[PDB]
């Protein structure tokens, strides 16, 4: 059978590999570096485009750009570079031999779904392809046809009620606030403590810090009080040039913005609130199988202690005769990619692919007839 | 010479050993997580069954 | 001397980096282990309670 490349379009990490395997085989940063100055390398070759880990090692001399900003492809040129690198550098295979599965947000722009369909088929010459909602794949990785997924990426958070494998198009909710924003916010609040960070390279350390040291508090006022009353809510981090910095209440404050969007000046409601409001758009006999399967997904959900917080919050908004229970997969950061690996290796799914012939007949439009 | 050489060599012996130990620590983390995955999936299946039973019992 | 010294210095830097990554993998392993232990304790409790209910359900 044809080996399908599953490529998760994560906004701060690419996750890529082959279908039928239990885990991604390449996990690298979504970063394209291009030179700030030319002349840097003399006696050695210069290139102008570095991608992923190659770019990461050269960060000092590169201008980093993100291909995907807030789950939205913002530059077609940087999306292409990521792709060129995925196939030829990272997996070292011809894409033209391998069908492609691409991941997307709910309500991912149609003009974008098309430019993605077109770019894959004309330049890479893919034999077949498909595009699928991130949360639907994470639900298949959770072994379920039906449930509501809180998917919080490295850039967007969605609440996605799904039923018999279809995401409910009137009931889904979105929040632009997650891992990308979270770094920029963390950096702000550290400047406020007097650990000013103004350089973007230092920003990436702040990113790493965030992933390692942030934790979801179970009670925001009680932990805040604890940090005000004692310095036991602080963890040290040694910067790689030396210099020991102390990260305080910023640890739980940073992700606190997910529950209270007003802290960054939004009119948006919180991730627990949009969970509750999303299920309340659904019919009562499916509210049962939706509430019974509240699933966490994506990189932002890997902060410890999140389940007890989300269990709390949802039981407080929701009536005490729906079964409330948080499902947190063992490696929830990958559950989109794992769900794509499952879906692309089902014998029933092989009828669904966009073929090169259907693209030649209808142009990039074909995704809006084959994908749902 | 000899001291700088002996110090290097042991430093490499030590590095080699630290990489071996890193792979071992990595393996063990994987064995723990897998086990952790198996218990977790058994806990969850029992829970879903339990809640259906608390309800079946209330319903009955 | 110098060449050997430059090789030793490189060897030392590599050893430090491996030891930090190793300490991290140990910590992550310790954490999987903790995670696992709470999960096992829940698993037991959900099972007993699902079983306890199986008796009560039969009775109703």
Author numbering:
A (entry chain I): 6 to 377
B (entry chain H), C (entry chain G): 92 to 151
Paper quotes:
Muscle contraction requires a shortening of the sarcomere, the basic contractile unit of muscle, caused by the sliding of interdigitating thick and thin filaments. Here we present the molecular architecture of native cardiac sarcomeres in the relaxed state, determined by cryo-electron tomography. To obtain a near-native sample suitable for focused-ion-beam milling and cryo-ET analysis, we relaxed demembranated mouse cardiac myofibrils in the presence of EGTA, dextran and mavacamten. Our cryo-ET structure of the sarcomere in the relaxed state together with our previously determined structures of the sarcomere in the rigor state provide insights into muscle architecture and its molecular complexity, intricacy of regulation and sophistication.
The tomograms showed that the thick filaments were indeed in the OFF state, as defined by the absence of myosin binding to thin filaments. Using subtomogram averaging, we could determine the structure of the cardiac thin filament with tropomyosin in the blocked state (myosin-binding site occluded) at 8.2 Å resolution and the structure of the relaxed thick filament. We observed the presence of several cMyBP-C links in the C zone, suggesting that the N-terminal region can indeed interact with the thin filament. Despite our efforts, subtomogram averaging did not resolve any clear arrangement of the N-terminal region on the thin filament, indicating a high heterogeneity in these interactions, in agreement with previous reconstructions from isolated components. Our segmentation exposed the presence of a tether formed by 3 to 4 domains that blend in the signal of the thin filament with 43-nm intervals and high degrees of flexibility. Thus, the flexibility of the links can probably accomodate the mismatch of the 37-nm actin repeat in thin filaments and the 43-nm cMyBP-C repeat in thick filaments. Of note, the thin filament with bound N-terminal cMyBP-C domains appears in the OFF state, suggesting that cMyBP-C, at physiological phosphorylation levels and in the absence of myosin cross-bridges, is not a thin filament activator.
